[model samples]
Target: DLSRPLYKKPPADSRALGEWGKASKLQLNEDELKQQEELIERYAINIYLSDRISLHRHIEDKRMYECKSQKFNYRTLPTTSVIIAFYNEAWSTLLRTIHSVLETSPAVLLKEIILVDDLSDRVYLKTQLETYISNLDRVRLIRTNKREGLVRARLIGATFATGDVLTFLDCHCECNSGWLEPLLERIGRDETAVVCPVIDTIDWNTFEFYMQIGEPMIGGFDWRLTFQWHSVPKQERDRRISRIDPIRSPTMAGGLFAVSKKYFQYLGTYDTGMEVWGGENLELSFRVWQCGGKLEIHPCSHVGHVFPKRNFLQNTARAAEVWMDEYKEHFYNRNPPARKEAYGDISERKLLRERLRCKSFDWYLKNVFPNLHVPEDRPGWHGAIRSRGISSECLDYNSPDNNPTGANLSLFGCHGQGGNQFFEYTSNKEIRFNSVTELCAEVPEQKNYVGMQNCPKDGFPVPANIIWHFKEDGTIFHPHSGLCLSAYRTPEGRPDVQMRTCDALDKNQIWSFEK
Candidate 1:
């Protein structure tokens, strides 16, 4: 082997001597024949462009999206060992998150951001995040000595967090100032529920090969499960105020959301079995909806998430192949029909579930992500759900797909007694007027809602028609059972017969949940 030359000579393939120059009509010194002849072979490649394609296709690519948007008043709003897993995130962004958090965070809410270092290549994460926390009271940073992928790293972080509310976030998100209350509020009402903020792009790169052009951030999805963006055309944007816009997202970005630490504990942490960082987000998304607690995209808040220009490192498609099959299996065990249709086979996870003593996703749905009622009149959809007939089908909506289980959390419109303003109401909680006014006050200050004039109002100098007003408590008080209603409106309005019975009510109508 030593006899072999250090470099092999290029194949003797040449069109000609002076002819080579003529290939591009170059003269004698046509940037050729200078280096070793091997250069010619390499140069020959320029005749064609090098195009890198994917190694494999997505196991499941909705190429489109679905929306079952949920509204958030910001103003209102997490987890597992309260997980906060992140890789080498931009410090400025996390700080922005903290600032966004503190600016509008509610004092009554108890939550801790669990910073998980995915063995970030940067030294600061290993040193700074942990070091800085010594002075920062609420944060707890977990350092992983080895590089753990996103899903597993989340599991690692969840093991360390302490609050009953567990939340997940990307280190680089631009929070919607009052981000915490709504998430905390939703989880408080339904421990099984999984709530996510209305996702918007901080920046999207059109040049990126994979970047979707002009995707609507709101209407978020259709039925195929593909995601949509921008949302201006969906006619779904609340338009009245930036903060008040409702998003009926069928799924979530997973970068921001909250759940009960107990429910995650009961349902189990993210599928550690998932490959480094792929389908875990979707796995959690669909699972939460199909298994039980409703998966909602709130309207009150907005957070800008950076969509990387191009996934250069992810240049190859199969990069997430391993996770695909696994999630496909996760889908199946939870929703048999979907799994059968999905690409990868999850039979192995099914077996592993048995071996791991993993509970049926149904158990997760029933207990972890419990179903909240969506009235027939609401502009919502529920394709993925796990409900069984039983004696106490309280949360049932009685729809052909997923009947009402008596877990109605309705809404109130601008006609409410206060100022003809609209607000949210969950059927089973005590509403505190103080919190409501406190939260609604943020409307005028919101980047989106403060200036919009969709509804006419009086008395208040600013006269903003919509207001979140408070956060202490409120609930949907629907006098009629089996009544048709839009989650967005109450029936007591002008001539739109389409409206049903709904309105936000304090203590009497609002639910002050301690769960």
Candidate 2:
């Protein structure tokens, strides 16, 4: 029943398989092709716009409000089934990934870190992974004989992960401390919640092939007036979207995410025909939101990409330039609204959508899972919507900021210019109102840094833009800033809050984080 070769490769019929085919000789008006490219690229833009629209609203939520302590439990640790799919993954980064997990993960709830070796050519992996797994009780190494890419390989790994929750992370990662709990806990609250943490860069101190180290920011997309992140943004995020925590977005970063194991499997595990990895994240995001499930950004769980030597085969040469064409087509079919509304003349969209022959997104909502109720403004003119903790609501509701009253929205720009302002509607005005310039938080009797919390012992400190770090090996890392914000700490508390210490770096304190 496995339908491989999603694209046309000899015997596999293109029309029958929903792969590319010569359609009506497709009048290639240069304008038409250009429009198509714009349309495809706009899908990227929509994802970004979705996030940016929320950013300003988040910015407005700061209407003279103080950061409150523990709206969501900072200590609430949810078990995770970390899934890593590898193909010739090197020890340079993979080892660091394992060390990163071992160093930061809460042993009691991490469940297991499963490495799905997608048929690596490296000879040492067998002994390397096996020995590591044997020594680290939390590690589970499973080798797939076939050379599948990230999407399917991960699907394979998900099949074996026993945890109630699942997470996806890159092999080589530079994460912040105390990063796992936020995402895990978020998913625990809503089964259909699909999320990815911020993706930052890894500057292992050098350059390769004349490529300079990139800024420590996650990859974001932009389209017709939309900005999207792979994950959800924090409630307070507005001016500096990065500081806003993870925001709800249309596309995915393909790097990492966490989901309820049950719901992920029920989503049918990455599209079987999705060749290699390109658009799977977008597909998943749309399906999750369209079908019913919230996608969010978790402040606690963060991770950075530990980059490695790029082999053109992984992404077809131009580094990330040759992202993927087929993947875009697939996303267009599944989430055509992004294509039609914001991008190009996807007027011919339905034909391709019908070609996929999969369950209608509506069918997924009704049959595969419970229906999500996203706000009217969420999906924008033609976007997906997720509210409170609700993953999505199926609708083509009007989304102008002026008309803020879908699912019963009654005010305009409650907190932001776009639909993002809706998240701040709370009973208390002071709590809901905030100023962009400052935030309210809990400091302690003891001294702390310019922007951080004391021993979270008092309570789960408030959610604000704070730079924190984790110590591992011989250095410090702050995934929030993506900058190695000096690590600090206070005395007498368990290793939790981000802080500095006179002691040397502790491997146990090494945490993997993303914005």
Candidate 3:
């Protein structure tokens, strides 16, 4: 017989509003719909919908069959102090996060749950939250004297942690069944191994938990030092013996992970000088690998994090200056203004790197993240692609909604800051944007406008639509369309780009890149 129940039963009324993690549908009147929109506008998420969901909801067990069969010695596993740092978070969502952990984790292994409030101004979070938490077992609440931000708030929480391992979760997360054991098992085997769970997405509007399908992805970073989810490379897959084995990751998503308390402190827990949250995850990932430690994602561990719809040149600039040796130049190239950002003093970080005698960034690139394409490896003309037809305007990929792929190209005033306007006229005759080589400018057949698409991979025949030839006289010819890249004002007075019949005398066809 088991000492404790593995799953908690949801309350009767909770089932009416997505108790088993099913999508909750609402038929709100016009007034309620207006209220919903207002809440979304203020929180960037559907806090109105979250208020209706159960705090102790049950979600489907989404781990692999291989993972379910695997066993762990719970008696030998290390205890974890789960730390959650939040700002002015919603009441229901924050309570749901705490309840999920309490309902899912084993009693012996979960030493405590620490809630660090980063000076939230909400009145209910003061006495109301304290009263609610006081009645809960193994949960403690602490607040900062001032607004410390995520980086320092987590550090403040870590100081009071007494468990063998420290696990950080966002305030808007739901710990799934059997999530903690796999992470603790990995750390128990190797104290230096920092492990993370596969973060599943919880629909912000519907409050539906969607399980990840197909092969799991690992954490990676682009040249701009932004975190991205990338498929597990062939080399990494070949190294693993089982589907449930731990996946080595080059970077982390920063919000969810478990690390040994001793190892975390030993490796300089976090950059105390780095203000707020931007590059702390990458900095820790780089430090972990280069300083003779392992960072991995255990497939068996799964956590559901609310995907709230959704910053940070100085913090990333600090990371680059400290960890990225000569490779930091690549980051600066992508974000030109970041080079001049006031990243504060990084001498202590550099000294820590030296004291640890860490491996070079080159080694990190080759051994840890070989798949990351280096922008400098390919020779090409790199800068803003400006049009002679529109004075002071350059080609711009505007993705105000955050999805840039397949988006139409527009012309905007050239800021010379080299972000959205930056394009590379590659030697392969393909124009790439923002050092993302695969995203090339393409002109669809019979379509006059230019758009972005993934260029064909190596060893495959390249398509002519994605190819362009630059002439000495500043004309960009699309050989497939037999048209020249031209700039003109739309009926709405917006500057836009299109493919038109090439004419040697037409100045509107002229385009140039910064040499």
List the global CA lDDT of all models: 0.39, 0.43, 0.84
Q: Using TM-score as the measure, what is the rank order of every candidate, best first?
A: 3, 2, 1
Using lDDT as the measure, which candidate wins? 3
Per-model TM-score on C-alpha atoms: 0.43, 0.44, 0.81
Model 1 lDDT on a 0 to 1 scale: 0.39
Q: Which ten residues in a row have the lowest lDDT in candidate 1?
A: 49-58
lDDT of 3 by residue, 1-515 (tens): 12132335555454478776778889999999999999999988899989987788888776788877777777898999999999999999999999889888887788899999999999989999999998888899999999898888998999999999999998999877788989998999999999998888899888899877546789998887777888998889999998788999998854689999999999999878886557677778889998988999888888888888788778788888888888887777786878789998888888899898899989998999988766652434777888888868888987654666847888999988887887877668888775543578889889998888876554466788989899988899999989998888888988888888898777778877763
CA shift at 487, candidate 2, in angstroms? 63
lDDT of 1 by residue, 4-58 (tens): 2112223323442211111122233533435323432443221111111111101
The TM-score of predicted model 2 comes to: 0.44
Cα distance off (Å), candidate 3, residue 126: 2.7
